Design an enzyme around this catalytic site. Structure first.
Site, PDB file in Angstrom:
ATOM      1  CG  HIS A 246     -30.000  22.039  -0.476  1.00 40.75           C
ATOM      2  ND1 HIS A 246     -30.115  21.252  -1.592  1.00 40.75           N
ATOM      3  CD2 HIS A 246     -30.511  23.242  -0.813  1.00 40.75           C
ATOM      4  CE1 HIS A 246     -30.651  21.944  -2.572  1.00 40.75           C
ATOM      5  NE2 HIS A 246     -30.904  23.160  -2.127  1.00 40.75           N
TER       6      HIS A 246
ATOM      7  CE1 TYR B 122      -8.537  -3.589  -6.197  1.00 41.77           C
ATOM      8  CE2 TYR B 122      -7.627  -1.352  -6.152  1.00 41.77           C
ATOM      9  CZ  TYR B 122      -7.619  -2.663  -5.705  1.00 41.77           C
ATOM     10  OH  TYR B 122      -6.712  -3.019  -4.750  1.00 41.77           O
TER      11      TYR B 122
ATOM     12  CD  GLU C 163      -8.112   2.556  -8.401  1.00 44.23           C
ATOM     13  OE1 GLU C 163      -6.953   2.264  -8.046  1.00 44.23           O
ATOM     14  OE2 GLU C 163      -9.081   2.520  -7.623  1.00 44.23           O
TER      15      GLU C 163
ATOM     16  CB  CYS D  42      -0.986  -0.025   1.184  1.00 39.02           C
ATOM     17  SG  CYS D  42      -2.028   1.452   1.322  1.00 39.02           S
TER      18      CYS D  42
ATOM     19  CD  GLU E 101     -29.434  17.950  -0.830  1.00 39.84           C
ATOM     20  OE1 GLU E 101     -30.344  18.178  -0.005  1.00 39.84           O
ATOM     21  OE2 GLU E 101     -28.966  18.831  -1.551  1.00 39.84           O
TER      22      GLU E 101
ATOM     23  CE  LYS F  86      -5.771   3.933  -5.143  1.00 41.60           C
ATOM     24  NZ  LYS F  86      -6.320   2.649  -5.605  1.00 41.60           N
TER      25      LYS F  86
ATOM     26  CB  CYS G 267      -3.578   2.721  -0.932  1.00 41.02           C
ATOM     27  SG  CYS G 267      -3.471   1.094  -0.094  1.00 41.02           S
TER      28      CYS G 267
HETATM   29  C1  LIG Z   1      -1.870  -0.946  -7.397  1.00 42.96           C
HETATM   30  C2  LIG Z   1      -2.597  -1.302  -6.112  1.00 42.96           C
HETATM   31  C3  LIG Z   1      -3.452  -0.395  -5.574  1.00 42.96           C
HETATM   32  C4  LIG Z   1      -4.128  -0.661  -4.349  1.00 42.96           C
HETATM   33  N1  LIG Z   1      -4.936   0.367  -3.829  1.00 42.96           N
HETATM   34  C5  LIG Z   1      -5.562   0.151  -2.635  1.00 42.96           C
HETATM   35  C6  LIG Z   1      -6.347   1.206  -2.049  1.00 42.96           C
HETATM   36  O1  LIG Z   1      -6.465   2.315  -2.559  1.00 42.96           O
HETATM   37  N2  LIG Z   1      -6.941   0.944  -0.841  1.00 42.96           N
HETATM   38  C7  LIG Z   1      -6.793  -0.290  -0.217  1.00 42.96           C
HETATM   39  O2  LIG Z   1      -7.334  -0.459   0.855  1.00 42.96           O
HETATM   40  N3  LIG Z   1      -6.065  -1.271  -0.750  1.00 42.96           N
HETATM   41  C8  LIG Z   1      -5.436  -1.093  -1.930  1.00 42.96           C
HETATM   42  N4  LIG Z   1      -4.595  -2.123  -2.466  1.00 42.96           N
HETATM   43  C9  LIG Z   1      -4.392  -3.404  -1.739  1.00 42.96           C
HETATM   44  C10 LIG Z   1      -3.554  -3.281  -0.549  1.00 42.96           C
HETATM   45  O3  LIG Z   1      -2.265  -2.773  -0.927  1.00 42.96           O
HETATM   46  C11 LIG Z   1      -3.381  -4.691   0.131  1.00 42.96           C
HETATM   47  O4  LIG Z   1      -4.602  -5.239   0.320  1.00 42.96           O
HETATM   48  C12 LIG Z   1      -2.682  -4.652   1.434  1.00 42.96           C
HETATM   49  O5  LIG Z   1      -1.451  -3.989   1.272  1.00 42.96           O
HETATM   50  C13 LIG Z   1      -2.420  -6.060   1.969  1.00 42.96           C
HETATM   51  O6  LIG Z   1      -1.401  -5.970   3.118  1.00 42.96           O
HETATM   52  P1  LIG Z   1      -0.720  -7.155   3.722  1.00 42.96           P
HETATM   53  O7  LIG Z   1      -0.392  -6.834   5.109  1.00 42.96           O
HETATM   54  O8  LIG Z   1      -1.524  -8.357   3.432  1.00 42.96           O
HETATM   55  O9  LIG Z   1       0.654  -7.234   2.879  1.00 42.96           O
HETATM   56  P2  LIG Z   1       1.510  -6.173   2.007  1.00 42.96           P
HETATM   57  O10 LIG Z   1       1.201  -4.839   2.432  1.00 42.96           O
HETATM   58  O11 LIG Z   1       1.394  -6.533   0.605  1.00 42.96           O
HETATM   59  O12 LIG Z   1       2.941  -6.439   2.451  1.00 42.96           O
HETATM   60  C14 LIG Z   1       3.575  -7.764   2.422  1.00 42.96           C
HETATM   61  C15 LIG Z   1       5.039  -7.531   2.577  1.00 42.96           C
HETATM   62  O13 LIG Z   1       5.734  -8.758   2.760  1.00 42.96           O
HETATM   63  C16 LIG Z   1       6.963  -8.719   1.960  1.00 42.96           C
HETATM   64  N5  LIG Z   1       7.315 -10.033   1.620  1.00 42.96           N
HETATM   65  C17 LIG Z   1       6.719 -10.940   0.720  1.00 42.96           C
HETATM   66  N6  LIG Z   1       7.326 -12.106   0.751  1.00 42.96           N
HETATM   67  C18 LIG Z   1       8.352 -12.009   1.679  1.00 42.96           C
HETATM   68  C19 LIG Z   1       9.307 -12.874   2.156  1.00 42.96           C
HETATM   69  N7  LIG Z   1       9.405 -14.144   1.781  1.00 42.96           N
HETATM   70  N8  LIG Z   1      10.145 -12.426   3.076  1.00 42.96           N
HETATM   71  C20 LIG Z   1      10.038 -11.194   3.493  1.00 42.96           C
HETATM   72  N9  LIG Z   1       9.184 -10.264   3.138  1.00 42.96           N
HETATM   73  C21 LIG Z   1       8.334 -10.709   2.204  1.00 42.96           C
HETATM   74  C22 LIG Z   1       6.645  -7.911   0.786  1.00 42.96           C
HETATM   75  O14 LIG Z   1       7.801  -7.239   0.336  1.00 42.96           O
HETATM   76  C23 LIG Z   1       5.632  -6.894   1.321  1.00 42.96           C
HETATM   77  O15 LIG Z   1       6.283  -5.742   1.709  1.00 42.96           O
HETATM   78  C24 LIG Z   1      -3.940  -1.917  -3.655  1.00 42.96           C
HETATM   79  C25 LIG Z   1      -3.076  -2.884  -4.202  1.00 42.96           C
HETATM   80  C26 LIG Z   1      -2.384  -2.603  -5.436  1.00 42.96           C
HETATM   81  C27 LIG Z   1      -1.427  -3.663  -6.030  1.00 42.96           C
HETATM   82  C1  LIG Z   2     -27.000  33.863   0.334  1.00 43.08           C
HETATM   83  C2  LIG Z   2     -27.719  32.750   0.894  1.00 43.08           C
HETATM   84  C3  LIG Z   2     -27.166  31.525   0.836  1.00 43.08           C
HETATM   85  C4  LIG Z   2     -27.853  30.431   1.429  1.00 43.08           C
HETATM   86  N1  LIG Z   2     -27.275  29.217   1.318  1.00 43.08           N
HETATM   87  C5  LIG Z   2     -27.841  28.200   1.833  1.00 43.08           C
HETATM   88  C6  LIG Z   2     -27.223  26.889   1.660  1.00 43.08           C
HETATM   89  O1  LIG Z   2     -26.142  26.742   1.119  1.00 43.08           O
HETATM   90  N2  LIG Z   2     -27.931  25.779   2.184  1.00 43.08           N
HETATM   91  C7  LIG Z   2     -29.189  25.959   2.881  1.00 43.08           C
HETATM   92  O2  LIG Z   2     -29.782  24.968   3.343  1.00 43.08           O
HETATM   93  N3  LIG Z   2     -29.726  27.212   3.045  1.00 43.08           N
HETATM   94  C8  LIG Z   2     -29.098  28.317   2.548  1.00 43.08           C
HETATM   95  N4  LIG Z   2     -29.689  29.590   2.670  1.00 43.08           N
HETATM   96  C9  LIG Z   2     -30.932  29.763   3.385  1.00 43.08           C
HETATM   97  C10 LIG Z   2     -32.163  29.249   2.614  1.00 43.08           C
HETATM   98  O3  LIG Z   2     -32.278  29.966   1.384  1.00 43.08           O
HETATM   99  C11 LIG Z   2     -33.426  29.507   3.465  1.00 43.08           C
HETATM  100  O4  LIG Z   2     -33.235  28.924   4.748  1.00 43.08           O
HETATM  101  C12 LIG Z   2     -34.696  28.942   2.821  1.00 43.08           C
HETATM  102  O5  LIG Z   2     -34.793  29.385   1.468  1.00 43.08           O
HETATM  103  C13 LIG Z   2     -35.879  29.432   3.539  1.00 43.08           C
HETATM  104  O6  LIG Z   2     -37.096  28.975   2.843  1.00 43.08           O
HETATM  105  P1  LIG Z   2     -38.474  29.522   3.190  1.00 43.08           P
HETATM  106  O7  LIG Z   2     -39.441  28.600   2.675  1.00 43.08           O
HETATM  107  O8  LIG Z   2     -38.474  29.836   4.616  1.00 43.08           O
HETATM  108  O9  LIG Z   2     -38.537  30.781   2.465  1.00 43.08           O
HETATM  109  P2  LIG Z   2     -37.865  31.353   1.104  1.00 43.08           P
HETATM  110  O10 LIG Z   2     -37.258  30.249   0.337  1.00 43.08           O
HETATM  111  O11 LIG Z   2     -37.105  32.487   1.415  1.00 43.08           O
HETATM  112  O12 LIG Z   2     -39.044  31.801   0.322  1.00 43.08           O
HETATM  113  C14 LIG Z   2     -39.962  32.892   0.745  1.00 43.08           C
HETATM  114  C15 LIG Z   2     -40.685  33.334  -0.524  1.00 43.08           C
HETATM  115  O13 LIG Z   2     -41.848  34.134  -0.214  1.00 43.08           O
HETATM  116  C16 LIG Z   2     -41.867  35.298  -1.053  1.00 43.08           C
HETATM  117  N5  LIG Z   2     -42.551  36.375  -0.360  1.00 43.08           N
HETATM  118  C17 LIG Z   2     -42.154  37.084   0.733  1.00 43.08           C
HETATM  119  N6  LIG Z   2     -43.070  37.910   1.139  1.00 43.08           N
HETATM  120  C18 LIG Z   2     -44.118  37.807   0.356  1.00 43.08           C
HETATM  121  C19 LIG Z   2     -45.395  38.430   0.359  1.00 43.08           C
HETATM  122  N7  LIG Z   2     -45.735  39.340   1.250  1.00 43.08           N
HETATM  123  N8  LIG Z   2     -46.266  38.061  -0.570  1.00 43.08           N
HETATM  124  C20 LIG Z   2     -45.882  37.113  -1.493  1.00 43.08           C
HETATM  125  N9  LIG Z   2     -44.696  36.456  -1.599  1.00 43.08           N
HETATM  126  C21 LIG Z   2     -43.830  36.842  -0.631  1.00 43.08           C
HETATM  127  C22 LIG Z   2     -40.459  35.625  -1.308  1.00 43.08           C
HETATM  128  O14 LIG Z   2     -40.338  36.284  -2.549  1.00 43.08           O
HETATM  129  C23 LIG Z   2     -39.773  34.251  -1.375  1.00 43.08           C
HETATM  130  O15 LIG Z   2     -39.797  33.780  -2.680  1.00 43.08           O
HETATM  131  C24 LIG Z   2     -29.104  30.628   2.117  1.00 43.08           C
HETATM  132  C25 LIG Z   2     -29.672  31.901   2.190  1.00 43.08           C
HETATM  133  C26 LIG Z   2     -29.050  32.947   1.629  1.00 43.08           C
HETATM  134  C27 LIG Z   2     -29.693  34.293   1.745  1.00 43.08           C
END
Ligand SMILES: Cc1cc2nc3c(=O)[nH]c(=O)nc-3n(C[C@H](O)[C@H](O)[C@H](O)COP(=O)(O)OP(=O)(O)OC[C@H]3O[C@@H](n4cnc5c(N)ncnc54)[C@H](O)[C@@H]3O)c2cc1C
Ligand SMILES: Cc1cc2nc3c(=O)[nH]c(=O)nc-3n(C[C@H](O)[C@H](O)[C@H](O)COP(=O)(O)OP(=O)(O)OC[C@H]3O[C@@H](n4cnc5c(N)ncnc54)[C@H](O)[C@@H]3O)c2cc1C
Lengths: 484, 487
Positions: A460, A197, A201, A51, A465, A59, A56
Site C-alpha cells: 500500500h 489492439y 494502440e 516484433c 493491492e 510500438k 512490439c
Molecule cells: C504492430 C504490431 C504490434 C505487435 N505488438 C506486440 C506486442 O507488443 N507483444 C507481442 O507479444 N506481440 C506483438 N505483436 C505480434 C508479434 O510481432 C508476433 O506474434 C510475432 O512476431 C510472431 O513471430 P514469428 O516467429 O511467428 O514471426 P515474425 O517475427 O513475424 O517473423 C517472420 C519472419 O519471416 C520473414 N519471412 C516471411 N516470409 C519469408 C520468406 N518467404 N522467406 C524468408 N523470410 C520470410 C519475415 O520477413 C519475418 O522477418 C505485434 C504485431 C504487430 C504487427
Molecule cells: C511518513 C510515513 C509514511 C508511511 N508510508 C507508508 C506506506 O507507504 N505504506 C505502508 O503500508 N505504511 C506506511 N507507513 C506506516 C503506516 O502509517 C503505519 O504502519 C500504520 O498507520 C500503523 O497503523 P496503526 O493502526 O498501528 O496505527 P496508526 O495508523 O498510527 O494510528 C494510531 C492512531 O491512534 C491515535 N492515538 C495515539 N495515541 C492515542 C491516545 N493516547 N489516545 C487516543 N488516540 C491516540 C493516533 O492519533 C493515531 O491516529 C508510513 C508511516 C509514516 C510515518
C-alpha cells in the site's frame, strides 16, 4: 550427409529462438533465411522479426512517447508550472529515435550470427522444392532466379503474418502498421480501421502527435472494440479513449476511399457518411504468411486462411516439417512464438518432446490507458463450468482526483469456478496493468484460488493491492444463466 | 454486560478496521478513541490513522508530484518540445491539493460512524484506569479533565508509533515527517537524517521541488542506506539517487544544530563537517506510542522500547487486552495492521482464532526510482539452508536509452532454496516494482518454485517478464559461504 540439419524460413521471434538453440545447444548446422538484415521498406520485417522491427519494440517506444501528452497536462495538478501553450510534439524526432533503437538491435543480431558455429544467415525468399530442399530466390516470384539450394534433414516454417486488407476500391490508398512506422509527418486527421489492439494502440499514438485541431477517428464494423476481451473492460476503454479525443465509431467501415486533390483521402462509409483524412491505416487483422512458400511441393496441408496446420508439437503432416509462430494461427504473440521455438528444438534435437501450453497466456494492450489480461472471459468460462463467480472492482486512483483525469478509472474483474474458487481469469484496465498481469500469470499457471489472492497481505498504496481485496462476487453464472 | 463490548484506543489502520468489524459484523458496542478528527497540527494523525493523515496517502501523492521532474525532462527524447527554462515547481500548490485530498478522507470517515449502529467515536486521549475501564481525558496530562469513562469487556490498544528524536542540542530546530507535510515552502537546501525508507522518500520529494541551485543531503550514521533490504539493491539505489542530485552521506550524524541569522539551521556533524540548511528532517525511526496509556494500571507488560508485548493472536498478558499495529512493533505497515485488526475480531468475537502471518509480507519503497520486495534477503536464507541459489538480472530499459536517463537500471534478484527451488525472496529496483511485487507476493504465499516462474509465458514488452527469464543461478551459498558453484 544432408548439407544442413535445419533450415529455418523466417529469422523472427520463433525462428531465431529455434535456430540459435539448435546451433548452440545441440551443435547442429542451421541455415536461417530472411528478406533483409535491417528494418524498413520495402520489406519492413527483417532479421529479428516483426516484433523487433515493425511490432512490439517500436510500438512500445511510440506509445511511451504518446504518454507524455497526458503527463505534461496532468503535472499541473501537482504544482508543475511551464509554458503549456508553447508545447509541441515532434514526430520526426520520435521516429528518428525509434529508428536508431531498432537498427541497434538489428546490428546486434548480426554479431550473434558471427559468434555462433553452424548458424548461418541466408538472404532471399525461401521456398520449398520438396521436403528436403529449400530454395532461396531473389523475389517472391516463383520464377525469379534461384540464389541458393539448401539440402536439409529438417525444415522449420516461421514466416509470420502480414496485414489483412479489405477488398474495397481505394484499398491502395490506405497504409498498414508497416508504413505507419515510417510516416514522414504525424497526420492531423487520421482513421484507424479495425477494432483490434493494433488499431487502438495507433489511434493513441496518432492522437498525441497530431497538430492542434487534428482529430483521430477509430472505425470498427462491429458493435464494440476489442472483440474477445472482457466486455466490461471493452465498454470502459471505449469511454476513456473518447474522454481523450478519439472518436470511436462502432458499426462503421469504408466502402470507397478516394484521393482528394491535396493528397488527403476521402472516405465514404457503408453508412453513407463521408470524411476526409491525411492517412487511413488498415488494422483489420493479420493473416498467416504462407502464400509463397510452395507448401504444395512438399505436400504440407494448410487451412482456408493460409495457416499451416500443426499438432501440439508444431509438426505438420510431413514428419520432417515443423511450423511455429503466427503462421500457425494459434496465439499471435512473440513470447508464444519463442516458447514454441524452444519446444521444437527440445522435441527434435533432444528427444524430450515438449508441447507449448497455449492457455493462461497473458497479454497486454498498450492503449492509453493500458490493459493487462489473462485467462477466461465470463462468457467462455460460463459454458465450461457449473457456476462461475465474477468479482469486479473499480476506482479512480487518488492521484487522478488531483491530476484532472477523473475519467481514468482502474478496473479489476476476476472470474472463478465458483465450486472450488479456482481463478479462471483476471482482467484489468489502468496504468501498470501490463506489469501487474505478468505475476498474476504465474498465479493462474499454479492453480491459484480466490482465497490465495485475498489472503495475501496487500502492498500500500498501489493499484495492484485491489487484487487482494476481493472477497465477495458481484454476480454469477449458473448453467450459462446469469444469476444473482 | 458492560458499557461497551470493546473500546479501541486509536482510530487508525488497525483500530478502525477492528472497530468497524466488531460493530458492523457482530453488532457489538464498540467505542473508538482518537485525538482529533481532521488531519493537521498539533496532533497530526487523526481519525483514519497515520497512513491516511501524515503517512502513506499524502507521501504517495507527493512522490507522484516529485516524479514529474524526471518525466518532464525525459519527455525530450521522445520529441516533446517546450520552453525548458520555463518549468517551475510550485510547492504550495502541491500542499493545498494534498490537503484537499486528505480532508476529504477525513470526512468520509465521519460519515462511517453516522451509519454504523454500535460504532461510536469519542475524542481525546484514551488512557487506562483498570482492565475494564478506559478514560478519555482532555489531554495527555494525567491531570486533565477526565472527559468520559467507558465500562468495557475488551480493550484494543492500537495507538501506533511516533517519530523518534535525537537528544542533541538543537533537536527542537529540526522537524520530523509530521511537520514536513505542512511546510509552507519547499526547502532550497535540506538535510534528511536517517537511512530508512521515510528519509529516502522525503529526500526525493525535496530533491524535486527545491529552488534551482538548491541541494538535498541525506545523512546516515550507518554504512549503507536501507539496512535490511537486499545488499545489491541498496548499493544500486544509492548510485541512482546520486545520479539525480542527491548527496548520500554515509557514516554521518548531526552532532548539534543551532539557528542562523537568516533562520536557516547550521549543523555541525559528528565528523566535524558543517553545513547550513533550511530544514533538517529527522527520520531515524518510529517508536511505539504506549507511554501515556497508563498500562501500569491494567498490568500490561511492555518492552523496553515501549512496545506492547503480545502473542501471535495479539493478546497481551492480561487476557481481555489486545494490542495491534505499530504499537506491537512487529511489521510497521498499514496492511499488516489492518490484517491484525481483522484477525483480532475473528479470534475474540467470532471465536474463529486467527494469527496474522508476518512472513513474506511484500513492501515498497517510493524512492525515485522505486523498490518492491518480498521474502528473505540472501544473507538470512544462507543461515537457514545449506544450499541457496541467487538469480540476478539488470538491464537499462530501452525507453531509457531514448529518454536519456541512462542511469535508471531495472534490477531483479531472486533467492531460492536450491534443494527444491522454492523462491525464498524476490527483490526488484525500478519503475513499476511496487505494482509487480504485489502479485509476486501471492506466488510466494502459495509456495512458488523458480521453475513455476520461468515456465510462465512472458508478457512483452514489460520490465516484469524478466521474472520469467531467469533459469541459471549467478552464485550460491553453501553452508553459509558464498560460492561460484556447488561442488
Ligand atoms: C504492430 C504490431 C504490434 C505487435 N505488438 C506486440 C506486442 O507488443 N507483444 C507481442 O507479444 N506481440 C506483438 N505483436 C505480434 C508479434 O510481432 C508476433 O506474434 C510475432 O512476431 C510472431 O513471430 P514469428 O516467429 O511467428 O514471426 P515474425 O517475427 O513475424 O517473423 C517472420 C519472419 O519471416 C520473414 N519471412 C516471411 N516470409 C519469408 C520468406 N518467404 N522467406 C524468408 N523470410 C520470410 C519475415 O520477413 C519475418 O522477418 C505485434 C504485431 C504487430 C504487427
Ligand atoms: C511518513 C510515513 C509514511 C508511511 N508510508 C507508508 C506506506 O507507504 N505504506 C505502508 O503500508 N505504511 C506506511 N507507513 C506506516 C503506516 O502509517 C503505519 O504502519 C500504520 O498507520 C500503523 O497503523 P496503526 O493502526 O498501528 O496505527 P496508526 O495508523 O498510527 O494510528 C494510531 C492512531 O491512534 C491515535 N492515538 C495515539 N495515541 C492515542 C491516545 N493516547 N489516545 C487516543 N488516540 C491516540 C493516533 O492519533 C493515531 O491516529 C508510513 C508511516 C509514516 C510515518
Amino acid at each position: 550427409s544432408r548439407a544442413y540439419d535445419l533450415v529455418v524460413i523466417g529469422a523472427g521471434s520463433g525462428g531465431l529462438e529455434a535456430g540459435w538453440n539448435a546451433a548452440s545447444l545441440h551443435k547442429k548446422r542451421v541455415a536461417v533465411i530472411d528478406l533483409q538484415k535491417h528494418h524498413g521498406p520495402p520489406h519492413y520485417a527483417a532479421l529479428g522479426g516483426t516484433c523487433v522491427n515493425v511490432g512490439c519494440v517500436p510500438k512500445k517506444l511510440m506509445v511511451t512517447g504518446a504518454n507524455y501528452m497526458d503527463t505534461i497536462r496532468e503535472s499541473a495538478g501537482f504544482g508543475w508550472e511551464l509554458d503549456r501553450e508553447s508545447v509541441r510534439p515532434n514526430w520526426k524526432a520520435l521516429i528518428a529515435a525509434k529508428n536508431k533503437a531498432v537498427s541497434g538491435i538489428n546490428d546486434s543480431y548480426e554479431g550473434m550470427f558471427a559468434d555462433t558455429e553452424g548458424l548461418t544467415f541466408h538472404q532471399g525468399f525461401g521456398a520449398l522444392q520438396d521436403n528436403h530442399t529449400v530454395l532461396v530466390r531473389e523475389s517472391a516470384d516463383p520464377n525469379s532466379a534461384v540464389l541458393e539450394t539448401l539440402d536439409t534433414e529438417y525444415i522449420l516454417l516461421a514466416t509470420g503474418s502480414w496485414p489483412q486488407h479489405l477488398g474495397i476500391e481505394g484499398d491502395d490508398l490506405c497504409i498498414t502498421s508497416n508504413e505507419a512506422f515510417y510516416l514522414d509527418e504525424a497526420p492531423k486527421r487520421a482513421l484507424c480501421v479495425g477494432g483490434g489492439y493494433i488499431s487502438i494502440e495507433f489511434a493513441g499514438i496518432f492522437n498525441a502527435y497530431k497538430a492542434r485541431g487534428g482529430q483521430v477517428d477509430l472505425a470498427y464494423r462491429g458493435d464494440m472494440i476489442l472483440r474477445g476481451f472482457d466486455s466490461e473492460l471493452r465498454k470502459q476503454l471505449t469511454e476513456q479513449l473518447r474522454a481523450n479525443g478519439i472518436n470511436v465509431r462502432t458499426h462503421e467501415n469504408p466502402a470507397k476511399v478516394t484521393k482528394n486533390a491535396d493528397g488527403t483521402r476521402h472516405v465514404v462509409f457503408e453508412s453513407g457518411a463521408e470524411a476526409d483524412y491525411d492517412v487511413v491505416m488498415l488494422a483489420i487483422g493479420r493473416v498467416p504468411r504462407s502464400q509463397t512458400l510452395q507448401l504444395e511441393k512438399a505436400g504440407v496441408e494448410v487451412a482456408k486462411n493460409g495457416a499451416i496446420k500443426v499438432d501440439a508439437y508444431s509438426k505438420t503432416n510431413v514428419d520432417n516439417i515443423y511450423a511455429i509462430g503466427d503462421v500457425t494461427d494459434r496465439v499471435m504473440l512473440t513470447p508464444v512464438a519463442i516458447n514454441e521455438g524452444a519446444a521444437f528444438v527440445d522435441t527434435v534435437f533432444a528427444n524430450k518432446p515438449r508441447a507449448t501450453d497455449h492457455t493462461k497466456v497473458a497479454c497486454a494492450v498498450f492503449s492509453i490507458p493500458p490493459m493487462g489480461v489473462c485467462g477466461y472471459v465470463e462468457e467462455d468460462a460460463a459454458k465450461k463450468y457449473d457456476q462461475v463467480a465474477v468479482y469486479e472492482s473499480s476506482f479512480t486512483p487518488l492521484m487522478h482526483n488531483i491530476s484532472g483525469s477523473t475519467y481514468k478509472k482502474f478496473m479489476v474483474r476476476i472470474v472463478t469456478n465458483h465450486a472450488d474458487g479456482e481463478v479462471l481469469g483476471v482482467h484489468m484496465l489502468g496504468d501498470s496493468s501490463p506489469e501487474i498481469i505478468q505475476s498474476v500469470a504465474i498465479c493462474l499457471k499454479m492453480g491459484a484460488k480466490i482465497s490465495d489472492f485475498y489472503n495475501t497481505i496487500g502492498v500500500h498504496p498501489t493499484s495492484a493491492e485491489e487484487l487482494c481485496s476481493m472477497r465477495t462476487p458481484a454476480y454469477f453464472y449458473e448453467k450459462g444463466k446469469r444469476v444473482e
